[PDB]
Design a protein around this ligand. Structure first.
Ligand SMILES: NC(=O)c1ccc[n+]([C@@H]2O[C@H](COP(=O)([O-])OP(=O)(O)OC[C@H]3O[C@@H](n4cnc5c(N)ncnc54)[C@H](OP(=O)(O)O)[C@@H]3O)[C@@H](O)[C@H]2O)c1
Length: 312
């Protein structure tokens, strides 16, 4: 079996656990649930915890972390906590205060990772905004220099959006990661190759096929975990389709998130470290790639900085 504490070194010298706990739940789920399930996740062995301003759960997630520190289960340095800058805060003067507010919500001194949530800028408050993300990035760099974030990265960027940052004059810090939709139906092979070539970690969200939220996802879309190839592999290994989907990412060198608000499934998901897929299994999963991103709404596709038009 693998070690549950497996991590990879980021391009700034910090370390990221390769399995992360996804904390988003839709608004119909009471806010208090995030507290309970984040503690369960830590109990089960998750150390990388993924939150965001958008999730309206930072207080609950922060309290769970601090509760597990206070009772001696973990130390702060054992936890890798991520938050994200929401798209109405892209204007550079709004970036550091947004992080400060996230830190105060979680009652933490620092985040391990702060991401630009999305390249699709939205007007402060709110429609679409036009912001040079290089200016947003410079403000992110200042957050790292001040120690508010140990590491900084991006999310939902394509190759060209990454290149704009990487080629920026006077760049101080490369993004450590690009957190993107990634699963066997949309495996991001070319983007993965590019990220690897630049010492940028690809972090997979919706690795289990997304929460299929009606705001963002077509109910007609095939359900990832119902896929016959994933189910046949689950049968072969006497695992579950979810575990096959998570293991696939680990064997590609992708850091993988998994959201569950169910005690049994939270505990199940850490078993990703407990088996392997063969080369032939991995080939079978690669065959599933079909250019299906579950997040697929007019609200994204019509945006000037929508990442999905380019080849990768
Ligand atoms: N950067 C971004 O724009 C972005 C976008 C999407 C997500 N994310 C992050 O990534 C996290 C995960 O992605 P996601 O929210 O799309 O969900 P996901 O990890 O793809 O999970 C989808 C669903 O799978 C179910 N599940 C979990 N374990 C299972 C298992 N072992 N067997 C059968 N079903 C299982 C969960 O339902 P139950 O809760 O009922 O178990 C969950 O709702 C998010 O919570 C968030 O932290 C980021």
């Amino acid at each position: 079996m693998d070690s549950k504490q497996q991590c990879v070194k980021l391009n700034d010298g910090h370390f990221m656990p390769v399995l992360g706990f996804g904390t988003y739940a839709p608004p119909e789920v009471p806010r208090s649930k995030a507290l309970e399930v984040t503690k369960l996740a830590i109990e089960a062995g998750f150390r990388h915890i993924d939150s965001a301003h958008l999730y309206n759960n930072e207080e609950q997630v922060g309290l769970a972390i601090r509760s597990k520190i206070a009772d001696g289960s973990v130390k702060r340095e054992d936890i890798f906590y991520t938050s994200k800058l929401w798209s109405t805060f892209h204007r550079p003067e709004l970036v550091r205060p947004a992080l400060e507010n996230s830190l105060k919500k979680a009652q933490l001194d620092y985040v391990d990772l702060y991401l630009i949530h999305s390249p699709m800028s939205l007007k402060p408050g709110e429609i679409f905004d036009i912001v040079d993300l290089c200016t947003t990035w410079e403000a992110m760099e200042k957050c790292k220099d001040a120690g508010l974030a140990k590491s900084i990265g991006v999310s939902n960027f394509n190759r060209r959006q990454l290149e704009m940052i990487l080629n920026k004059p006077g760049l101080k810090y490369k993004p450590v990661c690009n957190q993107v939709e990634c699963h066997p139906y949309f495996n991001r092979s070319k983007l993965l190759d590019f990220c690897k070539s630049k010492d940028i970690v690809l972090v997979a969200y919706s690795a289990l096929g997304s929460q299929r939220d009606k705001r963002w996802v077509d109910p007609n879309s095939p359900v990832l975990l119902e896929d016959p190839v994933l189910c046949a592999l689950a049968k072969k290994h006497k695992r579950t389709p979810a575990l096959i989907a998570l293991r696939y990412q680990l064997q590609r060198g992708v850091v993988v998130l998994a959201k569950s608000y169910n005690e049994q499934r939270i505990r199940q998901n850490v078993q990703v470290f407990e088996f392997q897929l063969t080369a032939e299994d991995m080939k079978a999963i690669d065959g599933l790639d079909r250019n299906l991103h579950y997040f697929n709404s007019d609200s994204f596709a019509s945006h000037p900085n929508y990442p999905y038009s380019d080849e990768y």
